[PDB]
Design a protein around this motif. Sequence first.
Motif, PDB file in Angstrom:
ATOM      1  N   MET A   1      23.462  14.859  64.001  1.00 45.79           N
ATOM      2  CA  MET A   1      23.056  15.560  62.805  1.00 45.79           C
ATOM      3  C   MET A   1      22.742  16.998  63.202  1.00 45.79           C
ATOM      4  SD  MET A   1      20.559  16.948  60.736  1.00 45.79           S
ATOM      5  CE  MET A   1      19.058  16.471  61.592  1.00 45.79           C
ATOM      6  N   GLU A   2      23.479  17.935  62.593  1.00 43.64           N
ATOM      7  CA  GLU A   2      23.208  19.351  62.788  1.00 43.64           C
ATOM      8  C   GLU A   2      22.719  19.975  61.485  1.00 43.64           C
ATOM      9  OE1 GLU A   2      25.144  22.890  65.323  1.00 43.64           O
ATOM     10  OE2 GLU A   2      26.455  22.065  63.842  1.00 43.64           O
ATOM     11  N   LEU A   3      21.551  20.626  61.555  1.00 44.19           N
ATOM     12  CA  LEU A   3      20.945  21.246  60.391  1.00 44.19           C
ATOM     13  C   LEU A   3      20.877  22.744  60.664  1.00 44.19           C
ATOM     14  CD1 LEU A   3      19.676  20.813  57.651  1.00 44.19           C
ATOM     15  CD2 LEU A   3      17.482  20.416  58.743  1.00 44.19           C
ATOM     16  N   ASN A   4      21.523  23.556  59.815  1.00 49.62           N
ATOM     17  CA  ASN A   4      21.595  25.006  59.996  1.00 49.62           C
ATOM     18  C   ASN A   4      20.549  25.740  59.162  1.00 49.62           C
ATOM     19  OD1 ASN A   4      24.031  25.003  61.728  1.00 49.62           O
ATOM     20  ND2 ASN A   4      24.829  23.960  59.911  1.00 49.62           N
ATOM     21  N   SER A   5      20.334  27.011  59.515  1.00 50.87           N
ATOM     22  CA  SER A   5      19.520  27.923  58.721  1.00 50.87           C
ATOM     23  C   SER A   5      18.123  27.351  58.545  1.00 50.87           C
ATOM     24  CB  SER A   5      20.159  28.214  57.375  1.00 50.87           C
ATOM     25  OG  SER A   5      21.374  28.897  57.567  1.00 50.87           O
ATOM     26  N   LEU A   6      17.515  26.927  59.663  1.00 49.29           N
ATOM     27  CA  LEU A   6      16.227  26.260  59.579  1.00 49.29           C
ATOM     28  C   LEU A   6      15.181  27.212  59.005  1.00 49.29           C
ATOM     29  CD1 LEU A   6      16.272  24.552  63.058  1.00 49.29           C
ATOM     30  CD2 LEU A   6      16.452  23.372  60.887  1.00 49.29           C
ATOM     31  N   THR A   7      14.319  26.653  58.140  1.00 47.78           N
ATOM     32  CA  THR A   7      13.083  27.263  57.684  1.00 47.78           C
ATOM     33  C   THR A   7      11.929  26.307  57.971  1.00 47.78           C
ATOM     34  OG1 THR A   7      12.782  26.307  55.551  1.00 47.78           O
ATOM     35  CG2 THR A   7      14.397  28.137  55.693  1.00 47.78           C
ATOM     36  N   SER A   8      10.694  26.752  57.740  1.00 45.15           N
ATOM     37  CA  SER A   8       9.547  25.978  58.188  1.00 45.15           C
ATOM     38  C   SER A   8       9.518  24.623  57.480  1.00 45.15           C
ATOM     39  CB  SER A   8       8.257  26.752  58.004  1.00 45.15           C
ATOM     40  OG  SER A   8       8.080  27.092  56.638  1.00 45.15           O
TER      41      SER A   8
ATOM     42  N   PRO B   1      -5.567  16.611  59.079  1.00 46.21           N
ATOM     43  CA  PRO B   1      -4.236  16.920  59.592  1.00 46.21           C
ATOM     44  C   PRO B   1      -4.104  18.433  59.751  1.00 46.21           C
ATOM     45  CG  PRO B   1      -4.081  15.573  57.579  1.00 46.21           C
ATOM     46  CD  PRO B   1      -5.531  15.976  57.746  1.00 46.21           C
ATOM     47  N   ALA B   2      -3.330  18.852  60.752  1.00 47.07           N
ATOM     48  CA  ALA B   2      -3.083  20.252  61.011  1.00 47.07           C
ATOM     49  C   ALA B   2      -2.173  20.813  59.935  1.00 47.07           C
ATOM     50  CB  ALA B   2      -2.460  20.388  62.378  1.00 47.07           C
ATOM     51  N   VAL B   3      -2.307  22.125  59.714  1.00 45.23           N
ATOM     52  CA  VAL B   3      -1.391  22.899  58.904  1.00 45.23           C
ATOM     53  C   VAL B   3      -0.657  23.887  59.815  1.00 45.23           C
ATOM     54  CG1 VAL B   3      -1.209  24.392  56.877  1.00 45.23           C
ATOM     55  CG2 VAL B   3      -2.979  22.646  56.928  1.00 45.23           C
ATOM     56  N   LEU B   4       0.662  24.010  59.608  1.00 47.96           N
ATOM     57  CA  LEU B   4       1.454  25.015  60.269  1.00 47.96           C
ATOM     58  C   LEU B   4       1.338  26.295  59.443  1.00 47.96           C
ATOM     59  CD1 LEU B   4       3.382  25.607  62.580  1.00 47.96           C
ATOM     60  CD2 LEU B   4       5.267  24.759  61.225  1.00 47.96           C
ATOM     61  N   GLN B   5       0.729  27.324  60.015  1.00 49.38           N
ATOM     62  CA  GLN B   5       0.539  28.609  59.365  1.00 49.38           C
ATOM     63  C   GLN B   5       1.831  29.426  59.439  1.00 49.38           C
ATOM     64  OE1 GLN B   5      -3.772  29.930  60.758  1.00 49.38           O
ATOM     65  NE2 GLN B   5      -2.565  29.019  62.395  1.00 49.38           N
ATOM     66  N   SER B   6       1.886  30.546  58.700  1.00 50.40           N
ATOM     67  CA  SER B   6       3.092  31.350  58.638  1.00 50.40           C
ATOM     68  C   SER B   6       3.381  31.995  59.985  1.00 50.40           C
ATOM     69  CB  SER B   6       3.025  32.400  57.529  1.00 50.40           C
ATOM     70  OG  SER B   6       2.100  33.437  57.866  1.00 50.40           O
ATOM     71  N   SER B   7       2.365  32.100  60.843  1.00 53.15           N
ATOM     72  CA  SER B   7       2.527  32.628  62.192  1.00 53.15           C
ATOM     73  C   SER B   7       3.299  31.680  63.100  1.00 53.15           C
ATOM     74  CB  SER B   7       1.187  32.894  62.826  1.00 53.15           C
ATOM     75  OG  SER B   7       0.439  31.692  62.880  1.00 53.15           O
ATOM     76  N   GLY B   8       3.492  30.434  62.672  1.00 57.59           N
ATOM     77  CA  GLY B   8       4.156  29.460  63.520  1.00 57.59           C
ATOM     78  C   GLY B   8       3.173  28.678  64.382  1.00 57.59           C
ATOM     79  N   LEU B   9       1.878  28.951  64.205  1.00 55.92           N
ATOM     80  CA  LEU B   9       0.808  28.301  64.939  1.00 55.92           C
ATOM     81  C   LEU B   9       0.068  27.340  64.010  1.00 55.92           C
ATOM     82  CD1 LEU B   9      -0.582  31.431  66.872  1.00 55.92           C
ATOM     83  CD2 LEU B   9       0.928  29.633  67.714  1.00 55.92           C
ATOM     84  N   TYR B  10      -0.552  26.325  64.618  1.00 54.63           N
ATOM     85  CA  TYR B  10      -1.292  25.338  63.855  1.00 54.63           C
ATOM     86  C   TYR B  10      -2.769  25.718  63.738  1.00 54.63           C
ATOM     87  CZ  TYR B  10       2.678  22.067  64.155  1.00 54.63           C
ATOM     88  OH  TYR B  10       3.920  21.469  64.151  1.00 54.63           O
ATOM     89  N   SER B  11      -3.406  25.068  62.756  1.00 52.10           N
ATOM     90  CA  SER B  11      -4.864  25.200  62.569  1.00 52.10           C
ATOM     91  C   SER B  11      -5.330  23.862  61.997  1.00 52.10           C
ATOM     92  CB  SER B  11      -5.262  26.311  61.639  1.00 52.10           C
ATOM     93  OG  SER B  11      -6.668  26.398  61.485  1.00 52.10           O
ATOM     94  N   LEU B  12      -6.495  23.402  62.412  1.00 53.08           N
ATOM     95  CA  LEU B  12      -7.046  22.192  61.762  1.00 53.08           C
ATOM     96  C   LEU B  12      -8.571  22.292  61.806  1.00 53.08           C
ATOM     97  CD1 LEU B  12      -8.433  19.948  63.793  1.00 53.08           C
ATOM     98  CD2 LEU B  12      -6.084  19.230  64.055  1.00 53.08           C
ATOM     99  N   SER B  13      -9.209  21.559  60.907  1.00 49.33           N
ATOM    100  CA  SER B  13     -10.681  21.522  60.924  1.00 49.33           C
ATOM    101  C   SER B  13     -11.179  20.090  61.146  1.00 49.33           C
ATOM    102  CB  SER B  13     -11.267  22.120  59.672  1.00 49.33           C
ATOM    103  OG  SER B  13     -11.256  23.538  59.706  1.00 49.33           O
ATOM    104  N   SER B  14     -12.285  19.966  61.863  1.00 52.37           N
ATOM    105  CA  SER B  14     -12.976  18.700  62.053  1.00 52.37           C
ATOM    106  C   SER B  14     -14.398  18.912  61.567  1.00 52.37           C
ATOM    107  CB  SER B  14     -12.987  18.265  63.490  1.00 52.37           C
ATOM    108  OG  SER B  14     -13.656  17.006  63.601  1.00 52.37           O
ATOM    109  N   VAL B  15     -14.883  18.016  60.705  1.00 51.09           N
ATOM    110  CA  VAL B  15     -16.210  18.148  60.134  1.00 51.09           C
ATOM    111  C   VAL B  15     -16.967  16.839  60.330  1.00 51.09           C
ATOM    112  CG1 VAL B  15     -15.384  19.763  58.347  1.00 51.09           C
ATOM    113  CG2 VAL B  15     -15.657  17.333  57.803  1.00 51.09           C
ATOM    114  N   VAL B  16     -18.287  16.925  60.159  1.00 51.57           N
ATOM    115  CA  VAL B  16     -19.137  15.761  60.240  1.00 51.57           C
ATOM    116  C   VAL B  16     -20.358  16.036  59.378  1.00 51.57           C
ATOM    117  CG1 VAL B  16     -20.243  16.532  62.404  1.00 51.57           C
ATOM    118  CG2 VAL B  16     -20.215  14.099  61.827  1.00 51.57           C
TER     119      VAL B  16
END
Lengths: 222, 133, 214
Positions: A81-88, A174-189
């Motif tokens: 399977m080849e997928l072209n023109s990848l976006t996030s 769950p983590a979110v992929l930001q527009s920078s291409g980096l992840y961010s997540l929060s942990s709370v209690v």
Amino acid sequence: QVQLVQSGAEVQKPGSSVKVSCKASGGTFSRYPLIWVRQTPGQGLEWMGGIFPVIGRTNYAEKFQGRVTITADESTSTAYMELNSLTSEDTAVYYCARLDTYEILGYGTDVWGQGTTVTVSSASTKGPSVFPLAPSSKSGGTAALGCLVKDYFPEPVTVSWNSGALTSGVHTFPAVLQSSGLYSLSSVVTVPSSSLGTQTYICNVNHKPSNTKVDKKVEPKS
Amino acid sequence: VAVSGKWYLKAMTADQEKPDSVTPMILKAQKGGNLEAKITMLTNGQCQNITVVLHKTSEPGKYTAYEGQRVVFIQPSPVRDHYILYCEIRMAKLLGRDPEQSQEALEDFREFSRAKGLNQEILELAQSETCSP
Amino acid sequence: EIVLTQSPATLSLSPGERATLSCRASESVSSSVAWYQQKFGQAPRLLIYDASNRATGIPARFSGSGSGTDFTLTISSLEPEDFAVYYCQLRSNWPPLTFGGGTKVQIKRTVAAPSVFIFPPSDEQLKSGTASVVCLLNNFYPREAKVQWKVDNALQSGNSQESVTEQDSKDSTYSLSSTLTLSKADYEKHKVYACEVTHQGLSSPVTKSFNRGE
Ligand SMILES: [Cl-]
């Protein structure tokens, strides 16, 4: 017993293409539909297309028509399977599957590959920064506090609290992929507000891809 | 297993020389690999219940029946929800999910029979849900 | 194209209850329907093929029925391990092999409003040129909730992301985080940061706020 083994996890830049392989052992695809299916994180299953020997054709879902190419190589018992023109938004788990549909009536012995994660990002491997989500001065005797795990790549991170001794009331999102291409997540209690003077709260973050560790003390702000 | 499937026998041919009516064909698969097919046929004013047990081979879609003496090849048609059965007399049969004739399925069935060297004048069977003597 | 509709898309039940899941094809597809179970983070598991045939090892409480356009998966009496998402799919030698949109089978509980908490950006983060403001909606049910950010009373758009937990195994609630991301420059131009929450369990929207600088 037929097994399908897919190529490993891929990181691709927006605009590039990815080619995922699916190797059959113990059997072939010559009489059976070979299909590709994806699932974006936390979302549903989508059929992308397949090779359909009964009609001698490869067919695609509308959504992917013109952007995905599915092929197979008889001699290597391998489908692709080849997928072209990848976006996030093509960040997903991709699966191959051989469907047991040839017999007029059979036993439903469908075989799926293990899945291949494709992550569309321009980023390089990077350990997280961890920032406090400080408990407010101001509630049923309870306070919310947490850690923001920002700017890491790739997945995953692990988070504990107080070396795993604190588990009650913990929510790690769950983590979110930001527009920078980096992840961010929060942990709370949530904890007793009477405890805030006395009991230390430390989030233990581990990012194995970078061999990094962060431990952050979270306390009321001065 | 005890898996099940329902079908219509819509057309037949052979390399030699016929039900007035047929009921649907029902298939049951048994733990072990075998299939059992059942259909009722109106012939000479009488209702005949036919059962055939198709025994597994090591090849998918290929079975043995009639105490080893018949070999049967079953394959999906290019036309949606149809199958072709080939047997060796030497005979071929067209099965469909829909009782109504598909001209496309019939056309493909003609080309199949020609490849097998069967009589190209295909007999289309009339359908009825029940058999009335 | 052929579309498979799974409606309702959520069912809220409990161990002991029957579950009847629907899948409607946009046109006739005979018996060419499969059902799958999928739990969060796991691979799909085939339950039913050919509309009515159980895959190997599948327990008898799972049965599939239908032919034509209207298909049903029945779980005669739910067990704890049966809370999952269920998909139908066209499965045949012939294309297309479209999936339905899925029906989530969750644990029912009473309505519970979120407890809302707002968190200002850390000084340490601010130093770097970016501000993350976090809003937590804790332990609510059902899952539908709207979070809106307002900065000096202006509704924000495009600069927030939300994430949600899986149903809690003990109390059957969800939690959600919303993160507003700003440049330090933009953060420093305004005073009041507010998270406004609407939910079935709240009779009015709830707002948590701070003024930039304790
Ligand atoms: Cl059971």
